Amino acid sequence: SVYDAAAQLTADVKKDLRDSWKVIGSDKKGNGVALMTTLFADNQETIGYFKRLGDVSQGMANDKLRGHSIALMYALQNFIDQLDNPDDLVCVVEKFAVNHITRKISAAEFGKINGPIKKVLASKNFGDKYANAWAKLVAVVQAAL
Amino acid sequence: SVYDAAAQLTADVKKDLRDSWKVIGSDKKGNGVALMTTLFADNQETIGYFKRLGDVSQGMANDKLRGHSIALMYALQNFIDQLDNPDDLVCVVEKFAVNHITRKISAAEFGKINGPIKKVLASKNFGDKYANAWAKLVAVVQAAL
Numbered sequence: 001s002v003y004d005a006a007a008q009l010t011a012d013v014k015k016d017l018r019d020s021w022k023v024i025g026s027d028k029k030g031n032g033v034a035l036m037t038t039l040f041a042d043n044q045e046t047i048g049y050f051k052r053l054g055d056v057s058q059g060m061a062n063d064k065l066r067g068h069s070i071a072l073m074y075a076l077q078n079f080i081d082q083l084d085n086p087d088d089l090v091c092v093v094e095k096f097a098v099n100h101i102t103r104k105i106s107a108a109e110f111g112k113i114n115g116p117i118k119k120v121l122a123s124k125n126f127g128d129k130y131a132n133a134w135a136k137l138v139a140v141v142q143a144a145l
Numbered sequence: 146s147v148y149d150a151a152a153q154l155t156a157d158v159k160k161d162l163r164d165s166w167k168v169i170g171s172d173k174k175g176n177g178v179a180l181m182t183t184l185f186a187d188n189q190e191t192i193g194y195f196k197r198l199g200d201v202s203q204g205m206a207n208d209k210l211r212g213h214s215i216a217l218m219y220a221l222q223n224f225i226d227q228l229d230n231p232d233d234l235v236c237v238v239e240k241f242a243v244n245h246i247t248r249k250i251s252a253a254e255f256g257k258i259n260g261p262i263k264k265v266l267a268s269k270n271f272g273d274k275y276a277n278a279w280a281k282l283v284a285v286v287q288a289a290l
């Protein structure tokens with residue numbers, strides 16, 4: 001269950017999540033867009049899912065892509081803030097899960113976000129340990145898909 | 146025009162929005178649910194739009210409503226953080242406007258949230274001055290509907 005996934009997150013993992021988010025979460029517009037464009041660059045097969053945002057190659061100049069990228073970072077902000085209460089993390093994770101379930105996004109496809117995250121983290125010198133911490137948070141969402 | 150509405154957010158208004166947000170934003174789960182239940186209580190005709198959340202009369206005991214409510218508070222958090230830049234404020238407002246346009250929510254009905262907000266602020270000792278500042282932020286979203 002999603003609860004099992006959340007309840008598993010340990011103190012050391014929450015620590016790494018919080019420490020890395022302090023940095024990558026401080027520039028939501030910049031890092032959010034970088035996350036999205038990196039996803040499009042390495043997984044071109046996903047572009048079709050974002051037709052609403054228009055031309056995603058426009059990057060920062062694309063207002064729709066900019067608005068989406070910022071809202072995504074607040075969804076992650078929401079997750080980070082709920083870390084100490086599995087009950088709250090679960091209901092927010094499930095809320096956002098529905099947003100992707102309606103778009104027919106499977107658990108496997110959602111996990112494609114791990115690559116971009118690993119790269120953004122690296123650009124700030126957060127190594128594999130931190131990428132693994134984030135893969136665990138992503139897995140919580142996957143448990144709901 | 147969403148851009149002209151955003152222009153209505155002067156130095157004084159932005160200050161009042163930030164000061165009051167520091168208090169209400171500190172308990173996103175509690176005040177978020179307070180907002181929603183007050184909306185449903187004083188405007189029963191809107192309950193129908195929220196079919197997905199199930200029985201909203203259960204308030205805090207409804208996991209779907211709680212998740213939704215928290216998420217809503219992070220959307221407000223997003224607006225507050227974008228007050229410095231009118232261009233970013235507009236792209237995020239338009240992002241969430243689309244979420245309501247697809248649900249057939251008009252500018253007039255979206256405005257029904259002003260009542261709940263005034264009440265929640267009042268319960269925290271913030272008067273008409275703050276309720277009116279929030280009415281202006283809400284108006285920016287209305288202009289995009």
Ligand code: HEM
Pocket residue numbers: 046049050051052053068071072075076096099100103105109110111112113138244
């Ligand atoms: C940590 C990673 C992710 C987070 C936190 C996240 C968050 C979000 C949020 C907040 C929305 C807006 C929901 C709405 O308003 O309807 C959204 C929409 C969407 N997401 Fe994700 N997402 C993530 C990863 C992904 C991945 C990997 C895919 C691709 C397979 C995906 C596909 C979509 C699609 C297609 C939309 C709809 C965009 C639109 O038309 O507006 N997401 N996501």
Ligand code: HEM
Pocket residue numbers: 099191194195196197198213216217220221241244245248250254255256257258
């Ligand atoms: C302070 C003003 C408001 C904010 C910031 C806000 C924010 C949000 C957010 C972030 C979502 C989730 C979007 C999604 O995932 O699809 C949402 C959904 C929704 N909102 Fe609002 N909202 C506000 C006021 C209202 C009002 C006044 C109404 C109706 C009279 C309304 C009707 C809806 C509906 C029907 C949904 C979809 C619920 C669902 O099926 O999950 N909203 N809102």
